Amino acid sequence: QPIFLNVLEAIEPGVVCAGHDNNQPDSFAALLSSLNELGERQLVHVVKWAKALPGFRNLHVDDQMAVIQYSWMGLMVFAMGWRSFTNVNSRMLYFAPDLVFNEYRMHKSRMYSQCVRMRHLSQEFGWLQITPQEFLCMKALLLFSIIPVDGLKNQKFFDELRMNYIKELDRIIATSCSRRFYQLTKLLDSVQPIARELHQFTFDLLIKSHMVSVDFPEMMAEIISVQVPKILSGKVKPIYFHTQ
Ligand SMILES: C[C@]12CC[C@H]3[C@@H](CCC4=CC(=O)CC[C@@]43C)[C@@H]1CC[C@@H]2O
Ligand SMILES: c1ccc(OCCSc2nc3ccccc3[nH]2)cc1
Numbered sequence: 001q002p003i004f005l006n007v008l009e010a011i012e013p014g015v016v017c018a019g020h021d022n023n024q025p026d027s028f029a030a031l032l033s034s035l036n037e038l039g040e041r042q043l044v045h046v047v048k049w050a051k052a053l054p055g056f057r058n059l060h061v062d063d064q065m066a067v068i069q070y071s072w073m074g075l076m077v078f079a080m081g082w083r084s085f086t087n088v089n090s091r092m093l094y095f096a097p098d099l100v101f102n103e104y105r106m107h108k109s110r111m112y113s114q115c116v117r118m119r120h121l122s123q124e125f126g127w128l129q130i131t132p133q134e135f136l137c138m139k140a141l142l143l144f145s146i147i148p149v150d151g152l153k154n155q156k157f158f159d160e161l162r163m164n165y166i167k168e169l170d171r172i173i174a175t176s177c178s179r180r181f182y183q184l185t186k187l188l189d190s191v192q193p194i195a196r197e198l199h200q201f202t203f204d205l206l207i208k209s210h211m212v213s214v215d216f217p218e219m220m221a222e223i224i225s226v227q228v229p230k231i232l233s234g235k236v237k238p239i240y241f242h243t244q
Helices: 003-011 028-051 061-087 103-108 112-128 132-142 155-173 176-189 191-207 218-226 228-232
Strands: 093-096 099-101 146-148 236-238
Touching (some): 003 132, 003 155, 028 099, 028 218, 061 093, 061 112, 061 146, 061 191, 093 112, 103 112, 112 176, 112 191, 132 155, 132 176, 155 176, 176 191, 191 218, 191 236, 218 228, 228 236
8 A cells, every 4th residue: 555655755866956156146147057057966866766666667768768858847846846845935946955046036047937936836835735745646747747749659658657647646645535636636737837938948048058158067958959849849748637
């Protein structure tokens, strides 16, 4: 019975620091390069985490890289909102212990409205009173929530895995159980429009980066110019539970 949860809680990654120098005055270039660095850092964890998920290693290996590459934004954002919820009560954006966005940093990052949506996301955990177990299952399901419209190499395996994760979440929930399931499914869905705003933003930023003194690490640069445009151009689409 508690085997699946045991794994989720066991493999949950720990604190990742951004490397940000809070002594330097908040500037758009500084704030954004630190996010990029954080992103690159958190990426390593996401890989090791994902490969340690129950059933994940039996996806086709190409599909293993692909789904990680399409879903990191949504994963990292959903986690951050959780950190923000548990650490600063959704009042600020707790990207890392060494990189917390107050109101001022939200403005300086030129990402204000996105940050507002992300804060809203964070406030939801409070609103819905999400248990940590619910959070871990939802976060794992997020990794199977976005795919090419033309299918993966072994779609069959993907579909079975995804179904198992959905039934895992149901179990963790269980009128009361019906309403509840609807809520987390709508909450999970709400992650995708936010991920997309961030995909749009980071892509525009990459294009004009040499122009605005904002550095991108190798893996971020690679992914944002090869994988993210597939999402933007509509070759990769998220899987929503409810019709938008
Ligand atoms: C993509 C990004 C750098 C990586 C950030 C991302 C915002 C969302 C986010 C939350 C995290 O906790 C990890 C870093 C990431 C993934 C940043 C938005 C603009 C910047 O380029
Ligand atoms: C191929 C496809 C999926 C696979 O597992 C998906 C993990 S879901 C799951 N939840 C469980 C809960 C209890 C016991 C076993 C469980 N398996 C394994 C091989």
